[PDB]
Write a protein that binds this DNA or RNA. Structure first.
Ligand SMILES: Nc1ncnc2c1ncn2[C@@H]1O[C@H](COP(=O)(O)OP(=O)(O)NP(=O)(O)O)[C@@H](O)[C@H]1O
Ligand SMILES: [Mg+2]
Ligand SMILES: [Zn+2]
Lengths: 339, 607
DNA sequence: CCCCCCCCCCACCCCCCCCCCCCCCCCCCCCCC
DNA sequence: GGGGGGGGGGGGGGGGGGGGGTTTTTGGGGGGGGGG
C-alpha cells in the first residue's frame, strides 16, 4: 500500500536543534544554572519524577532570540499545534543532555540498572569477538507541557462543546467539573520478556490501546543459532506507567439553552495521576487526541498535561479567644444574614 | 456522457453567476475580513454561502435544474467555482447553501419518496434524537521518521461525498513503501465534526390515524449543533441511499430495504404559522410608540386570547409570565429564580385548557404536557443508548426542552405523585439532577410552568378550605407564583355575555373559503404581540428602585397581617419587574408595584 | 372487620488456523579404493 | 573393509486460503396497609 506525500512548513531536525538549544540556555533571569538543566539534575538524583515545560519560557526564549535578531520559527505555535510529537522530541533532547547524579542513591537495588548492566556486559563480550534498549525503558521521568499564561490557544479556557474537531492534536485547556474518576491502573510502556532458552531478555514498546504478545525469541543469541526459544512476560522488568481515566463535564453556565451537558474523557498518566477528584471544578490542559474504535467516526479524549483547581492554627485561635464574646458572636455567625 | 467533460463549463457558468449577482462576492469578502480581523485582534464565521436559488434560476435555468435534479454533478463544480472566487479575494474549501421556491422538492418525512433519491430536497419537521457530535476523519498525515517526508491519506464514506466514491477502511498507515515506520501527525491531520439527527413529520400534518414518519439527516462542520431536539426545522440537503441493502450474500433476508439519509446543506429554525423574529426599525418604533399608551398592559392582555371572554386577571398574569422578571445570581453562586409559575384550578369548561393552548401558540418556546400522558422520567430526562456509538446518553424531557421558555401542563392534578415528585426541583431550583446508570449530572430547566387542574371534587366546593378542595400538596402549591381559583358560577348577565361572545367566535370563516366549506376596543395582532414579547425579553432588564420598594413592603405587610408566606414577596417583585418590562422601562416604578399588588391580591383574595 | 387501593416485583480488516506443496536433509545401499 | 556418493523417503517450513468476530413503560398478580 503506497502513500502520496506533501511538503509542510515544519522541519523536525531544525526544531530538535531549537529545542535542545533552549533546554541548555534558558533561565528566569528577571527573578534575580539554566532552569531545565537544574531540573534535569534533580531528575538525575531521582528526587523529581516530572519535567514541567513552560510555554512561557519558550516565549521568553523566542523573544530573547528575536531581540538578538535571529528567527526562531515560533516553537510555541508549533508545539501548541502538534504537542504529541513534541513530547517525544523533548524527551529525546533530555535523554541526550541529562547530566549524571550529584547525589548517590544506592543504585544496585534498581532492577532496570542491573538488567541493562548485565546486557552491556554480554554485549561487550560479543563486541570483543568472544540502541542498547528502547529509550522509554530507561526514561524514569514524565514530561508535561504547562500552558501559556494570559498576557494563545493553550491559554484559553474552552467549554467541552467548544472543543470542535479542528482542535485534535493541539494542546488545549478545558474548563469543567469532574463527574467521575477511575481507580489507578498500570498501563504498559515497555513490556519485558525473559527468554527461557538463552536468558537474553527482549522488549516490546506499546503505543496503542491493545498489543499482541511476543512468542519466538527475536534476539540474535537465539535467531543466529536458529533456536526457536520461548519468550515469557515479566512484570518486574517491564516498565509500567500509572494510568487513570477521568470524565470532565461542562458547567451549568456553559450549557446553552435546552441542551444536555456534554462531557469528555480525560486520560492522565505518570506523576499527574490522582490530581483530579470528582466534584473538582478545574481547568485541565492536555493534548486533545483521537482513538480509533463506526468507520470514520472517532473516539476522542484529552491527554492531561496540567491541572489548575478553582478552589498557625494553634496560635491563631488565640486571636478569637482574646477577641472575646465568643459564644454570642460565633452563634450569630451561623448564617449571619438570617435574622 | 461523462461528468468530467462538462465540469469546466459548469464551473465557469457558476463563476459568471457569482460575478453577476455580486452580493455573493460581497458576502465572501465580508466573511473573510471578519475572520481576519478576529484572528488578528486577540468568533469565526463559516466558509458557507446561502445562494437564493431564484437568482440561479433567473441566471441559467439549465444549471438551476441541474442543482435541483442532479446535485451530485452540479454542487461540486459550484463549490469549486465559489472556492476559486474566495481564492481570488486577497489573502480551505467553501460550501454552499440554498433558499427559496423548491416547488415539488419541498417535502416532509412522509411524502419524501424513493423517486426523490439523489435529488436536492427541502423537508419540514421537528428534530428528535440528535446524536453526539464526533470528529470524522477525512485526512491523516504521517511523518516517516527515517525518510523525512510527510505521507498522507485521504478517506471517504457515503456521507462525506455526494457521489459514491470507493470506501477507505479508516485504517491509519504505519509503514512506508520501503517499510520505514510511520508516526501519525495530529494537528496536521484533518477531521470534520459529524452529527446525525432524526427529523420527524409535524403531527399537525400527519393524515387521519397515521403516526408521524421520520428520516435521518447528516450534518457536517458548522451545521453541527444548529438544532436541539424539539426544534421545528426546515432542512435542505441531498436525499441519498447508502449501504448494501442486503445484497451482500451474508444477509439471507430477501425483503429488507436500503438505508437512506439527507446529507444536509442548510438548517433553518422555524416558528411560521422563524424561531427568532427579525425586527425592522419600523417594528422598533411601533413597539416603543405602543409602550407609551397609558394603558398598554390592558391592551396587550386583552389582546391575548381574543377568542376567550373574561378571565382578565388571568390573561394579565399570563402576559407577565411570558415576560418574567430578571433572574438574580448572588454570592457563592446563590440563585433566585425569575420565572412566574401559574396554576389555574377550577370548575370544568372555564377555558383553562384553551388558555394553555393559546400560551402554547404564543410563547417563543413552549412544550405541551398532560397529566396522565406524562411520565416523571419523560418530564425530566431519560437514559437511552445512542445507537450511533453504543453509549448511554440522556434524552431531554419536557422540562429540559422548555429551558428559557415555558411548560404547559393540562390535567395537572391527574398526575401520579412519582411524576409530581419530579416537578419539585424544576420549580424550586430551575434544574433537574440525574443519579442513575452511572450518569451523575444536573441539567438546566429554567422555565415558567403554567398548569391547569380541577379540585378533588368535580367542581370547586366553597363550603371547604383550599387545601381540602385542591389535590396538590402545600409543598407544591407554595412553589407557584400565582394560584388562581376559577368557577363556572351561574349568572344570567355573565351567561348572556359569554354566550353571545362564543356565538360570534363560532360564526368565524377564514379568508377565501366558501360559505359552509370545510377547512384544509383597540387590540394588537398576535404576530405583533409575539414581537413585543421578544423585544421586551431581549432589550430591557428593569432595575429595582426605592419608590417601588416602598409600595412593595407596604402591600406585602398589609396582605400578610390581615396563606401568605415569605415566598409571596419575591413573587410581588417578579410581577412588578415583569410589568416594568411591559412598559419597556429600565426601572421598576411605583406603578409596577401597584399593579403587581393588585393582581396578586386578586389571586389570593378572589378580589 | 372488610374492602379497596396502592405498592412491589417481574418480564471490512486482521488473527487464528489449517492444508498443501516443495525442498532439503538424513539415512541406506552400492561401488570404489 | 571402510568411506564416499547417489538416490529415495520423510519431515518441516512457508505460503495461501478461509472463516469468524440497561432503563423505561405496561400489564398482571399478589401482598400489605388504611379508612368506614
Ligand atoms: N370564557 C370563555 N370564552 C369562550 N369560550 C370559553 C370560555 N370558557 C370556556 N370556553 C369554552 O369551553 C370549552 C372547554 O374549554 P377548556 O379550556 O377545555 O375548559 P377547561 O377549563 O380546561 N375544562 P376541564 O379540562 O374539564 O377542566 C372550549 O371550547 C372553550 O372555547
Ligand atoms: Mg382542561
Ligand atoms: Zn532467546
Amino acid at each position: 500500500a503506497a502513500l502520496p506525500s506533501i511538503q509542510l512548513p515544519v522541519d523536525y531536525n531544525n526544531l530538535f536543534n531549537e529545542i535542545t538549544d533552549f533546554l541548555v540556555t534558558f533561565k528566569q533571569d528577571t527573578l534575580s544554572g539554566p532552569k531545565y538543566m537544574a531540573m534535569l539534575q534533580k531528575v538525575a538524583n531521582r528526587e523529581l519524577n516530572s519535567v514541567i515545560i513552560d510555554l512561557d519560557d519558550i516565549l521568553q526564549y523566542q523573544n530573547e532570540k528575536f531581540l538578538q535578531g535571529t528567527q526562531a520559527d515560533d516553537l510555541v505555535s508549533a508545539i501548541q499545534q502538534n504537542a504529541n510529537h513534541f513530547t517525544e522530541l523533548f524527551c529525546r533532547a533530555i535523554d541526550n543532555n541529562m547530566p549524571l547524579p550529584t547525589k548517590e542513591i544506592d543504585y544496585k537495588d534498581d532492577v532496570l540498572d542491573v538488567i541493562l548492566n548485565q546486557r552491556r556486559l554480554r554485549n561487550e563480550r560479543m563486541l570483543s569477538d568472544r540502541e542498547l534498549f528502547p529509550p522509554n525503558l530507561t526514561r524514569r521521568y514524565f514530561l508535561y507541557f504547562k500552558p501559556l499564561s494570559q498576557n494563545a490557544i493553550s491559554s484559553k479556557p474552552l467549554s467541552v462543546r467548544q472543543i470542535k474537531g479542528d482542535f485534535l492534536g493541539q494542546l488545549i485547556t478545558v474548563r469543567g467539573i469532574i463527574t467521575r474518576v477511575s481507580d489507578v491502573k498500570p498501563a504498559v510502556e515497555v513490556i519485558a520478556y525473559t527468554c527461557d532458552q538463552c536468558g537474553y531478555e527482549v522488549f516490546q514498546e506499546v503505543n496503542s490501546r491493545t498489543f499482541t504478545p511476543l512468542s519466538e525469541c527475536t534476539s540474535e543469541e537465539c535467531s543466529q543459532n536458529q533456536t526457536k526459544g520461548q519468550l515469557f512476560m515479566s512484570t518486574r522488568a517491564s516498565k509500567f506507567s500509572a494510568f487513570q481515566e477521568c470524565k470532565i463535564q461542562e458547567l451549568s453556565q456553559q450549557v446553552p439553552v435546552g441542551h444536555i451537558p456534554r462531557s469528555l474523557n480525560i486520560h492522565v498518566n505518570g506523576t499527574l495521576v490522582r490530581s483530579l477528584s470528582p466534584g473538582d471544578i478545574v481547568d485541565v490542559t492536555g493534548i486533545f487526541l483521537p482513538a480509533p474504535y463506526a468507520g470514520l467516526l472517532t473516539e476522542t479524549y484529552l491527554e492531561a498535561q496540567f491541572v489548575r483547581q478553582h478552589k498557625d492554627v494553634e496560635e491563631r485561635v488565640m486571636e478569637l479567644i482574646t477577641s472575646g464574646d465568643v459564644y454570642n458572636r460565633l452563634a450569630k455567625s451561623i448564617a449571619p444574614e438570617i435574622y | 456522457f461523462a461528468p468530467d467533460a462538462v465540469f469546466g463549463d459548469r464551473v465557469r457558468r457558476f463563476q459568471e453567476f457569482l460575478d453577476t449577482f455580486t452580493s455573493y462576492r460581497d458576502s465572501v469578502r465580508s466573511i473573510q475580513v471578519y475572520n481576519s480581523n478576529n484572528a488578528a485582534n486577540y468568533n469565526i464565521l463559516p466558509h458557507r454561502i446561502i445562494i437564493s436559488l431564484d437568482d440561479l434560476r433567473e441566471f441559467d435555468r439549465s444549471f438551476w435544474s441541474g442543482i435541483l435534479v442532479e446535485p451530485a454533478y452540479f454542487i461540486p463544480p459550484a463549490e469549486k467555482a465559489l472556492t476559486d472566487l474566495a481564492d481570488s479575494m486577497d489573502d480551505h474549501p467553501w460550501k454552499l447553501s440554498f433558499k427559496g421556491s423548491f416547488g415539488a422538492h419541498a417535502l416532509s418525512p412522509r411524502t419524501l419518496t424513493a423517486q426523490h433519491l439523489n435529488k436536492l430536497v427541502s423537508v419540514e419537521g421537528i428534530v428528535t434524537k440528535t446524536s453526539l457530535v464526533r470528529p470524522k476523519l477525512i485526512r491523516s498525515v504521517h511523518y516517516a521518521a527515517k525518510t523525512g517526508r510527510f505521507h498522507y491519506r485521504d478517506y471517504t464514506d457515503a456521507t462525506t461525498t455526494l457521489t459514491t466514491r470507493i470506501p477507505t477502511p479508516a485504517i491509519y498507515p504505519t509503514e512506508d513503501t520501503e517499510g520505514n515506520k510511520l508516526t501519525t501527525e495530529y494537528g496536521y491531520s484533518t477531521f470534520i465534526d459529524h452529527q446525525r439527527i432524526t427529523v420527524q413529520e409535524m403531527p399537525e400534518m400527519a393524515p387521519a390515524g397515521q403516526l408521524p414518519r421520520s428520516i435521518d439527516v447528516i450534518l457536517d462542520d458548522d451545521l453541527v449543533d444548529k438544532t436541539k431536539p424539539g426544534d421545528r426545522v426546515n432542512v435542505v440537503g441531498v436525499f441519498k441511499s447508502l449501504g448494501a441493502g442486503g445484497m451482500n450474500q451474508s444477509n439471507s433476508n430477501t425483503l429488507i430495504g436500503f438505508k437512506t439519509l439527507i446529507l444536509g446543506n442548510t438548517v433553518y429554525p422555524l416558528h411560521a404559522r422563524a424561531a427568532r423574529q427579525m425586527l425592522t426599525d419600523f417594528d422598533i418604533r411601533n413597539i416603543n410608540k405602543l409602550s407609551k399608551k397609558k394603558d398598554i398592559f390592558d391592551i396587550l392582555s386583552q389582546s391575548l386570547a381574543p377568542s376567550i371572554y373574561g378571565h382578565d386577571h388571568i390573561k394579565k398574569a399570563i402576559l407577565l409570565m411570558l415576560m418574567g422578571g430578571v433572574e438574580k445570581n448572588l454570592e457563592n453562586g446563590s440563585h433566585l429564580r425569575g420565572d412566574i409559575n401559574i396554576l389555574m384550578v377550577g370548575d370544568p369548561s372555564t377555558a383553562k385548557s384553551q388558555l394553555l393552548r393559546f400560551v402554547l401558540n404564543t410563547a417563543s418556546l413552549a412544550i405541551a404536557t398532560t397529566g396522565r400522558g406524562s411520565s416523571g422520567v419523560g418530564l425530566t430526562a431519560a437514559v437511552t443508548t445512542d445507537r450511533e456509538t453504543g453509549e448511554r446518553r440522556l434524552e431531554a424531557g419536557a422540562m429540559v426542552l422548555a429551558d428559557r421558555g415555558v411548560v404547559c401542563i393540562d390535567e395537572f392534578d391527574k398526575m401520579t405523585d412519582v411524576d409530581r415528585v419530579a416537578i419539585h426541583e424544576v420549580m424550586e431550583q430551575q434544574t433537574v439532577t440525574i443519579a442513575k446508570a452511572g450518569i451523575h449530572t444536573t441539567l438546566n430547566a429554567r422555565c415558567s410552568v403554567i398548569a391547569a387542574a380541577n379540585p378533588v371534587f368535580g367542581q370547586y366546593d366553597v363550603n371547604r378550605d383550599p387545601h381540602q378542595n385542591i389535590a396538590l400538596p402545600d409543598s407544591l402549591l407554595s412553589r407557584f407564583d400565582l394560584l388562581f381559583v376559577v368557577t363556572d358560577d351561574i349568572n344570567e348577565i355573565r351567561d348572556r355575555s359569554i354566550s353571545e361572545h362564543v356565538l360570534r367566535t363560532h360564526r368565524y370563516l377564514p379568508p377565501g373559503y366558501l360559505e359552509g366549506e370545510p377547512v384544509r376596543p383597540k387590540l394588537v395582532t398576535i404576530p405583533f404581540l409575539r414581537k413585543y414579547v421578544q423585544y421586551a425579553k431581549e432589550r430591557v432588564i428593569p432595575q429595582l428602585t426605592q419608590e417601588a420598594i416602598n409600595v412593595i413592603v407596604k402591600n406585602y405587610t398589609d396582605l400578610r397581617n390581615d396563606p401568605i408566606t415569605a415566598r409571596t414577596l419575591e413573587t410581588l417583585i417578579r410581577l412588578a419587574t415583569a410589568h416594568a418590562k411591559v412598559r419597556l422601562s429600565k426601572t421598576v416604578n411605583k406603578v409596577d408595584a401597584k399593579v403587581a399588588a393588585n393582581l396578586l391580591r386578586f389571586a389570593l383574595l378572589g378580589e
